């Protein structure tokens, strides 16, 4: 697992061809949001403060990338 | 503070092996555990590594010497007569 501290680098990673899927994790106790993209070798995580612009980053993310919100319970 | 009257380093043997043998081993133990001045760097850091091997901790030089002393009187007399024989041969 790798952490990305640059929005531009995260945008290029999400536009890589091997980016199979993406998910959004919300931590309201910490008041943060996490964008996790699943590539071939590494899972890349971008950590942001919970904000409207952090929500609008979805619009800058590519459309063909299947993005989903993490549920409260990881049901097996 | 002197703790033993005469046994010295041989006090580790207690009452064993005989007074004469303890006195015989004491001098070899003292001269083999003493520190010596190096003839290359001048520091007092030459100690015995193995049998006839004397290493300096400072300049890292290893010399071949006697079993329990750095230099043997026979070896020193040998060096003296070798020097005079070499002088005679060259002259």
């Amino acid at each position: 697992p790798q952490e990305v501290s640059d929005i531009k680098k995260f945008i290029e990673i999400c536009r890589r061809k091997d980016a199979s899927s993406a998910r959004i994790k919300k931590n309201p106790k910490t008041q943060q949001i996490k964008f996790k993209v699943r590539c071939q070798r590494f899972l890349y995580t971008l950590v942001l403060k919970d904000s409207d612009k952090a929500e609008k980053l979805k619009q800058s993310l590519p459309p063909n990338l299947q993005i989903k919100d993490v549920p409260k319970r990881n049901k097996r | 503070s002197k703790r033993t009257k005469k046994v010295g380093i041989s006090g580790k043997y207690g009452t064993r092996y005989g007074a004469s043998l303890r006195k015989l081993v004491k001098k070899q133990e003292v001269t083999q555990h003493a520190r010596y001045t190096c003839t290359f760097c001048g520091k007092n850091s030459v100690r015995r590594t193995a049998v006839g091997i004397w290493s300096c901790k400072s300049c890292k030089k290893t010399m071949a010497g006697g079993a329990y002393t750095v230099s043997t009187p026979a070896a020193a007399a040998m060096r003296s007569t070798l020097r005079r024989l070499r002088e005679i041969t060259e002259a």
């Binding site: 501290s5 640059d6 929005i7 531009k8 945008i11 290029e12 536009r15 942001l48 403060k49 904000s51 612009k53 952090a54 609008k56 980053l57 619009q59 800058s60 | -």
Partner: protein, 49 residues
């Protein structure tokens, strides 16, 4: 001159202070990039094209 324990503690405190300032400034630049994320996406699009 030989320094004092108070001076050593002051030097140390400046060291964690500058580390904290670097961390805060990195958070600020990440927030600014998040604010200007759409232009960044457009520039990435232009470079790929």
């Amino acid at each position: 001159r030989r320094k004092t324990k108070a001076e050593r503690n002051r030097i140390k405190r400046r060291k964690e202070e500058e580390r904290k300032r670097k961390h805060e400034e990195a958070m600020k630049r990440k927030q600014q990039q998040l604010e200007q994320a759409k232009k960044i996406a457009a520039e990435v699009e232009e470079r790929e094209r």
